[PDB]
């Protein structure tokens with residue numbers, strides 16, 4: 213039982229907000245983050261999606277997954293997690309332009325693969341892996357989460373989500389950008405998104421920087437005539453890492469490796 | 485369900501061992517610690533004590549409690565946790581004699597109180613809090629655990645445990661050293677042990693260093709004529725902290741504060 217009784221959490225500064233909820237810093241036996249719906253009486257849909265998220269988080273005990281701590285239903289449906297100081301990998305690579313040594317870049321890839329390997333072993337498909345969803349706790353430890361879910365983006369309704377493409381387009385596998393289905397999401401589309409994260413780590417920049425419109429990326433990635441340019445990778449990038457990236461980014465999902473083998477390859481590369 | 489199927493954990497280097505089990509470094513979606521019984525067919529007593537420990541750990545989701553990750557029953561009863569690099573607080577204070585600034589000493593006390601406040605809110609009595617059981621993950625983050633349980637020391641049988649006094653005597657409340665009962669252990673004896681940890685932080689040394697025999701400490705602490713000498717505390721120790729220590733170390737257990745108030749006092753002192 214992880215329900216936190218009403219009145220125990222002290223809700224603090226507002227941290228993030230969108231059409232589907234708000235996240236605050238709070239206090240409950242130390243620092244916590246608290247994500248709640250902006251509404252008063254949830255629709256059955258809103259309640260059930262809340263339960264889906266809690267049921268995913270309740271399955272996770274791993275140092276590279278953000279730690280779920282509890283939930284509450286009075287007065288608002290809220291999810292409580294550990295509070296992490298630091299910032300997303302996206303901020304580090306593309307805003308502060310932190311200068312990570314190659315060793316630390318590989319360490320970040322390795323911790324990300326540990327968390328993703330764990331999630332897939334728990335039959336959890338992430339659906340929105342990207343560098344903004346990889347938090348560097350004290351700029352050292354990877355915490356995978358979905359930092360847009362139920363604030364800026366809605367919770368999942370099948371394979372639909374409001375603001376689905378928002379800040380996510382560059383990480384979407386070809387079969388996800390097309391959605392010739394009712395579920396394109398799989399372990400293999402998580403693997404593709406991880407390949408794009410590897411691209412960010414090894415180039416320091418976002419793919420398709422030269423393309424001038426989103427719909428262009430939509431069309432050409434869904435068509436198979438657009439792919440990350442692996443020649444823009446830094447010179448100190450290990451040969452193994454370029455091979456691995458190319459494997460994760462393959463157009464047909466069944467050709468991509470799985471995270472057990474991804475992780476073992478990165479572990480080998482880290483050993484050097 | 486947290487049972488890890490057989491064959492998934494790769495058991496590595498032996499880390500610790502005693503009459504009641506062994507702990508190894510291992511691999512399972514990253515680094516783990518794995519504690520198993522040294523035996524083949526456990527007695528009902530051994531099995532049940534294993535279940536007691538798993539049932540305590542399964543109740544904990546807190547950044548200052550060592551993260552339980554799973555257990556297994558084939559081929560040996562094993563408990564799996566995160567792997568922490570670093571060393572115990574005891575090692576830092578009394579072996580490497582690390583020079584912690586007062587701010588970091590207070591931070592360690594504050595994280596310890598967060599974890600203990602959480603445990604007591606979950607109705608978990610620790611029973612063996614001491615600086616060797618406070619792990620400094622990357623020498624920065626407190627992880628409370630019981631690092632002697634089911635290796636050097638046995639699991640709990642009521643209020644009995646083999647090697648109960650081993651390395652623990654200095655942290656035992658008067659009513660625990662006497663055991664005029666079948667259970668002297670309470671939230672309040674945890675609070676006393678925390679006071680002794682505060683003493684180690686503020687003096688840098690172990691209480692009763694001058695006394696030459698264990699049985700002397702037994703007798704005089706059980707009698708009430710022996711107490712930590714708070715005048716040996718460092719000069720930069722805040723007045724609030726000496727007051728708090730004296731409160732936690734009171735002889736009659738009902739006079740000691742509880743961890744919600746302990747934590748709020750340390751949080752205030754940290755703010756300065």
Ligand SMILES: Cc1ccc2c(Nc3cccc(Cl)c3F)nccc2c1NC(=O)c1csc2c(N)ncnc12
Pocket residue numbers: 227228235245246247265268269277278291292293294295296297298338356357358359361
């Ligand atoms: C409260 C809360 C609940 C669920 C989360 C969540 N749920 C989730 C959903 C699907 C898959 C996975 Cl793996 C998930 F973890 N993901 C990420 C963050 C989640 C979260 N916290 C924040 O939103 C947050 C913003 S800033 C910040 C900070 N500085 N420290 C700690 N938290 C935060």
Ligand SMILES: Cc1ccc2c(Nc3cccc(Cl)c3F)nccc2c1NC(=O)c1csc2c(N)ncnc12
Pocket residue numbers: 499500507517518519537540541549550563564565566567568569570610628629630631633
């Ligand atoms: C495997 C395992 C299982 C249960 C533990 C346990 N159980 C427990 C019992 C009662 C109360 C509480 Cl709070 C508890 F956490 N406590 C502490 C450690 C526990 C543990 N790990 C070690 O023994 C360990 C030695 S070295 C090291 C390291 N470097 N990194 C991580 N682990 C270790």
Ligand SMILES: [Cl-]
Pocket residue numbers: 239241242243598747751
């Ligand atoms: Cl607090």
Ligand SMILES: [Cl-]
Pocket residue numbers: 270542
């Ligand atoms: Cl759980």
Ligand SMILES: [Cl-]
Pocket residue numbers: 315316319
């Ligand atoms: Cl590093």
Ligand SMILES: [Cl-]
Pocket residue numbers: 232258261362366367
């Ligand atoms: Cl929603």
Ligand SMILES: [Cl-]
Pocket residue numbers: 261264265367368
């Ligand atoms: Cl969801």
Ligand SMILES: [Cl-]
Pocket residue numbers: 369372
């Ligand atoms: Cl919909």
Ligand SMILES: [Cl-]
Pocket residue numbers: 326475479511513514515
């Ligand atoms: Cl690994």
Ligand SMILES: [Cl-]
Pocket residue numbers: 587588591
């Ligand atoms: Cl500090």
Ligand SMILES: [Cl-]
Pocket residue numbers: 504530533634638639
């Ligand atoms: Cl035992």
Ligand SMILES: [Cl-]
Pocket residue numbers: 533536537639640
């Ligand atoms: Cl036990």
Ligand SMILES: [Cl-]
Pocket residue numbers: 641644
């Ligand atoms: Cl016995």
